[PDB]
Amino acid sequence: MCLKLNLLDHVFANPFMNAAGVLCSTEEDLRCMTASSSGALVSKSCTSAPRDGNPEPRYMAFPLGSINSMGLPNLGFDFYLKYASDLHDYSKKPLFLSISGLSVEENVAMVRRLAPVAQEKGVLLELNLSCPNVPGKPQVAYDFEAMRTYLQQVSLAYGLPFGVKMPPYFDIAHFDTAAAVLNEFPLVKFVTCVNSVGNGLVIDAESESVVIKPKQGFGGLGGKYILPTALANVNAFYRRCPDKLVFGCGGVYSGEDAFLHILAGASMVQVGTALQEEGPGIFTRLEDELLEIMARKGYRTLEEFRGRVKTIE
Amino acid sequence: MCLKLNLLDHVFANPFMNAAGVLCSTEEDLRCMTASSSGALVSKSCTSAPRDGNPEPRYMAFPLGSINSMGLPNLGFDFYLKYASDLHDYSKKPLFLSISGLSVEENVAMVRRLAPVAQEKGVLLELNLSCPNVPGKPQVAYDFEAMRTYLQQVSLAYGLPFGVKMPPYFDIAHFDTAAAVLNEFPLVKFVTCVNSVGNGLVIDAESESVVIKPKQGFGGLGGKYILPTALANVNAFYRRCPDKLVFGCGGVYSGEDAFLHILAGASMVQVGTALQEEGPGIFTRLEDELLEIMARKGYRTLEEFRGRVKTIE
Ligand SMILES: Cc1cc2nc3c(=O)[nH]c(=O)nc-3n(C[C@H](O)[C@H](O)[C@H](O)COP(=O)(O)O)c2cc1C
Numbered sequence: 001m002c003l004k005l006n007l008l009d010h011v012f013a014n015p016f017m018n019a020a021g022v023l024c025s026t027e028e029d030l031r032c033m034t035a036s037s038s039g040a041l042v043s044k045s046c047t048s049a050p051r052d053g054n055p056e057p058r059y060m061a062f063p064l065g066s067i068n069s070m071g072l073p074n075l076g077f078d079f080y081l082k083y084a085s086d087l088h089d090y091s092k093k094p095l096f097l098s099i100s101g102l103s104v105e106e107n108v109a110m111v112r113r114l115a116p117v118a119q120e121k122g123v124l125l126e127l128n129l130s131c132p133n134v135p136g137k138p139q140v141a142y143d144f145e146a147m148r149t150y151l152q153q154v155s156l157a158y159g160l161p162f163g164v165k166m167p168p169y170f171d172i173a174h175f176d177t178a179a180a181v182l183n184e185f186p187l188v189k190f191v192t193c194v195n196s197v198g199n200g201l202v203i204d205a206e207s208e209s210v211v212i213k214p215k216q217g218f219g220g221l222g223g224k225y226i227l228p229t230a231l232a233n234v235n236a237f238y239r240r241c242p243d244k245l246v247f248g249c250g251g252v253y254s255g256e257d258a259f260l261h262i263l264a265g266a267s268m269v270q271v272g273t274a275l276q277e278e279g280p281g282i283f284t285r286l287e288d289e290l291l292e293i294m295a296r297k298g299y300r301t302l303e304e305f306r307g308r309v310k311t312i313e
Numbered sequence: 314m315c316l317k318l319n320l321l322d323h324v325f326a327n328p329f330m331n332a333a334g335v336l337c338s339t340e341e342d343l344r345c346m347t348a349s350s351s352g353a354l355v356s357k358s359c360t361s362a363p364r365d366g367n368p369e370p371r372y373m374a375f376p377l378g379s380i381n382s383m384g385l386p387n388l389g390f391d392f393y394l395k396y397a398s399d400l401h402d403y404s405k406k407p408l409f410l411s412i413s414g415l416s417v418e419e420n421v422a423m424v425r426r427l428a429p430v431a432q433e434k435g436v437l438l439e440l441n442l443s444c445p446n447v448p449g450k451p452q453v454a455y456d457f458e459a460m461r462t463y464l465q466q467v468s469l470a471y472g473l474p475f476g477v478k479m480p481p482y483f484d485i486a487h488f489d490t491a492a493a494v495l496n497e498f499p500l501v502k503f504v505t506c507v508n509s510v511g512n513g514l515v516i517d518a519e520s521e522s523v524v525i526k527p528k529q530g531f532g533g534l535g536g537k538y539i540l541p542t543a544l545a546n547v548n549a550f551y552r553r554c555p556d557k558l559v560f561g562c563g564g565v566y567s568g569e570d571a572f573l574h575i576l577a578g579a580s581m582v583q584v585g586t587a588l589q590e591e592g593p594g595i596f597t598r599l600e601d602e603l604l605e606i607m608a609r610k611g612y613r614t615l616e617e618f619r620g621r622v623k624t625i626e
């Protein structure tokens with residue numbers, strides 16, 4: 001019985017990794033994620049220049065999930081590039097690098113610089129088109145024209161295999177259009193579904209107040225709230241992008257939740273809110289719990305059930 | 314002391330009502346909602362002609378909420394119009410009628426016939442622009458040019474105050490744009506936020522199967538999953554639509570959840586999933602719970618706290 005995978009020219013001990021933004025901002029965070037049982041890690045989305053992000057409180061967690069408006073905060077591209085070039089131990093596990101420039105120009109600027117590092121070291125790009133917390137800069141992937149431009153320019157500037165972090169969609173016509181944009185770009189080898197469900201609002205009944213400070217309390221939702229949305233987007237792109245990989249993200253707290261993502265079509269399974277709450281010990285739990293489900297069902301590998309969710313009649 | 318209110322030139326005993334589609338399809342259902350302690354009721358969304366709706370199973374509920382792909386099912390407009398014109402006892406509470414034609418022409422045809430009964434009896438139109446479960450017919454309010462065309466034509470054809478059942482949005486630019494489209498129409502006097510969170514996917518781990526039959530298992534989400542999304546939309550439209558009322562729908566299981574909706578800006582509060590699961594006895598519980606929270610905080614009216622959610626700094 002076995003959780004191993006072999007994809008994008010890398011070997012993964014298991015399908016689990018952090019979700020971008022969780023436990024991956026500093027060198028310390030990145031070492032911790034490397035020392036953990038995860039199959040891979042991804043760095044914090046970065047802009048070209050370092051940034052502070054939004055005023056605190058900007059993240060809060062509850063029994064059913066999390067709300068966040070982290071905004072810009074990252075140590076900057078130079079730092080994440082050096083991590084990938086000089087510091088990351090690739091013998092431990094594969095590394096993905098998330099970028100989220102504020103203009104197509106900014107992204108292209110960065111991906112020009114990442115390419116030689118990608119060629120040399122094997123770092124994998126994840127391009128973030130779905131941040132819901134920068135004011136005056138809505139989720140790029142909700143503007144399909146903008147999306148096609150970003151992907152053109154980045155494919156052209158980078159010229160190597162990469163993936164895209166997508167926002168959730170809620171409408172069958174949007175699934176159809178978005179997968180079709182993506183399928184114009186053969187260098188898009190993976191699609192990560194989903195980023196936070198944007199612009200929710202948590203209100204505390206006792207205080208009568210919002211619980212995060214930026215944007216009058218509005219922020220992206222993670223965790224239990226979003227699992228059926230995440231599974232929908234995972235399967236919707238799995239069905240519509242038969243030449244690409246789908247990475248699942250959203251609502252994973254258990255090996256059962258990972259099992260569902262995998263049934264829906266996920267290759268790698270990312271863990272945001274639950275990892276933020278539980279810490280990196282979650283990875284050993286998720287592995288054991290997923291193996292227990294596989295054992296009970298007689299499944300010996302991931303590809304025996306990946307994408308094999310059953311429909312009714 | 315008592316939760317009574319006036320809106321839209323009617324009087325309501327409390328802000329609670331069913332959500333359209335729940336406990337409101339048949340004459341029996343409507344009689345049962347009329348007999349309950351809700352402050353109002355809304356009929357099931359209807360098409361000009363009767364329809365059966367989708368294959369069963371089409372609704373399933375879980376601890377965290379519900380998924381549904383009910384699709385077309387209603388007794389047809391003639392039935393709901395006759396309920397409004399001849400059977401409803403307006404002495405007990407107000408009635409809303411929900412319409413959901415498949416084209417602008419169908420909606421125009423219905424509202425032309427509803428207009429006289431609205432003039433005579435005061436039945437209130439809730440126009441549904443957000444059904445996530447007709448194949449080929451995506452949520453009208455996710456296409457802003459289509460939404461403007463529907464609201465121009467209905468306003469011209471109806472000529473009396475009405476409301477719109479909105480889908481959730483997730484993007485501040487979308488809130489800005491949708492609210493500005495609504496604000497182009499002075500006859501749109503209330504905005505119901507939200508319809509179900511469209512096209513989620515529930516998967517049963519043991520059976521490895523989706524749980525509803527239509528649309529390969531995809532359906533709209535209700536219940537605990539959607540409360541922060543609902544609150545966000547309620548507040549977003551409450552802030553942007555100062556000359557309209559906002560009706561709250563989504564995730565209400567308790568008087569506390571109702572309190573949050575009303576803090577966010579809700580005038581009426583609609584109950585879907587929770588009502589489907591608990592039945593109409595829920596209304597006495599919701600009233601009792603809301604009165605109790607109000608007491609504990611020293612609020613005597615709903616006006617004292619509606620829209621008074623606090624932000625940080
Ligand atoms: C504190 C926080 C920071 C995040 N930062 C990023 C980020 O920098 N880039 C990104 O693509 N997504 C970011 N996200 C989104 C997550 O990667 C993930 O898509 C979302 O939380 C849903 O997964 P979950 O349900 O496991 O939390 C962040 C989420 C949280 C909670």
Ligand SMILES: Cc1cc2nc3c(=O)[nH]c(=O)nc-3n(C[C@H](O)[C@H](O)[C@H](O)COP(=O)(O)O)c2cc1C
Binds near residue numbers: 357441536587589
């Ligand atoms: C079985 C079912 C049928 C529904 N039918 C309708 C409908 O005919 N028209 C409509 O506007 N919304 C319909 N909805 C959406 C609800 O009115 C409501 O917007 C949604 O369920 C979210 O509220 P909740 O969280 O309380 O369930 C339906 C919901 C359910 C669960």
Ligand SMILES: *C(/C=C/c1cccs1)=C1C(=O)NC(=O)NC1=O
Binds near residue numbers: 045046101133196
């Ligand atoms: C926004 C992206 C933020 C970045 C900060 C520096 C570079 S990119 C977020 C996102 O993608 N997902 C979230 O849930 N929260 C965010 O703030």
Ligand SMILES: *C(/C=C/c1cccs1)=C1C(=O)NC(=O)NC1=O
Binds near residue numbers: 360381446533
């Ligand atoms: C669809 C609207 C369905 C109609 C059937 C006859 C007339 S209109 C739904 C909706 O608006 N919200 C839901 O959650 N489910 C539906 O099926």
